[PDB]
Design an enzyme around this catalytic site. Structure first.
Site, PDB file in Angstrom:
ATOM      1  N   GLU A  16       0.783  -1.177   0.000  1.00  0.00           N
ATOM      2  CA  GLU A  16       0.000   0.000   0.000  1.00  0.00           C
ATOM      3  C   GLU A  16       0.845   1.270   0.000  1.00  0.00           C
ATOM      4  O   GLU A  16       0.353   2.331  -0.347  1.00  0.00           O
ATOM      5  CB  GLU A  16      -0.799   0.006   1.315  1.00  0.00           C
ATOM      6  CG  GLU A  16      -1.793  -1.138   1.465  1.00  0.00           C
ATOM      7  CD  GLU A  16      -2.991  -1.015   0.569  1.00  0.00           C
ATOM      8  OE1 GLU A  16      -3.793  -1.894   0.415  1.00  0.00           O
ATOM      9  OE2 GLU A  16      -3.039   0.105  -0.073  1.00  0.00           O
TER      10      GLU A  16
ATOM     11  N   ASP B 211      -6.665   6.695  -4.353  1.00  0.00           N
ATOM     12  CA  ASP B 211      -6.220   5.367  -4.560  1.00  0.00           C
ATOM     13  C   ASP B 211      -6.371   4.890  -6.017  1.00  0.00           C
ATOM     14  O   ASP B 211      -6.790   5.648  -6.869  1.00  0.00           O
ATOM     15  CB  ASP B 211      -6.768   4.434  -3.491  1.00  0.00           C
ATOM     16  CG  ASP B 211      -8.222   4.029  -3.625  1.00  0.00           C
ATOM     17  OD1 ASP B 211      -8.779   3.259  -2.873  1.00  0.00           O
ATOM     18  OD2 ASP B 211      -8.772   4.377  -4.731  1.00  0.00           O
TER      19      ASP B 211
END
Length: 164
Positions: free
Chosen positions: A11, A20
């Site tokens: 991540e 994202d």
């Protein structure tokens, strides 16, 4: 290698609100703030989450606290889920990390929809499950990360992360 290092690899760490892969407002280590289009809705969720006026920005410490909470919630969620719990219980320590990783990313609900792969996993049919898991929007949208997880379930080792 452990769940935290694995997820920190997948991540990344960002200290400013960011979007994202799906375009949603996220901060820190994959902490989703809101699916709403409003940076403003995002900033308010963030302040709520941290307990201060952040103005879209947080410290490393805040990032880490959020990450701890999220991994904790991921694990508890699996343990409470009737479809996931039995899979989780049947796995070895490394493969357990692969399922936590999927849940962190796609939420309990989403992993729970991988019925068939979950069956193969429980049955310990490594190869078949890897092939089945690749047939997903998940694999198509985040292929390198999906490949890492899949390799983890396939082999039961941290090889896919040893590189990184």
């Amino acid at each position: 290698m452990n769940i935290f290092e694995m997820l920190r690899i997948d991540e990344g760490l960002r200290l400013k609100i960011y979007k994202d892969t799906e375009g949603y407002y996220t901060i820190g280590i994959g902490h989703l703030l809101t699916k709403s289009p409003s940076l403003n809705a995002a900033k308010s969720e963030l302040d709520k989450a941290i307990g201060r006026n952040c103005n879209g920005v947080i410290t490393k410490d805040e990032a880490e606290k959020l990450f701890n909470q999220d991994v904790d919630a991921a694990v508890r969620g699996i343990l409470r889920n009737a479809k996931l719990k039995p899979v989780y219980d049947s796995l070895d320590a490394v493969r357990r990390c692969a399922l936590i990783n999927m849940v962190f990313q796609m939420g309990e609900t989403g992993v729970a929809g991988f019925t068939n792969s979950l069956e193969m996993l429980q049955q310990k049919r490594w190869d078949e499950a890897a092939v089945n898991l690749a047939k997903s929007r998940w694999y198509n949208q985040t292929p390198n990360r999906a490949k890492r997880v899949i390799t983890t379930f396939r082999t039961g080792t941290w090889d896919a992360y040893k590189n990184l």
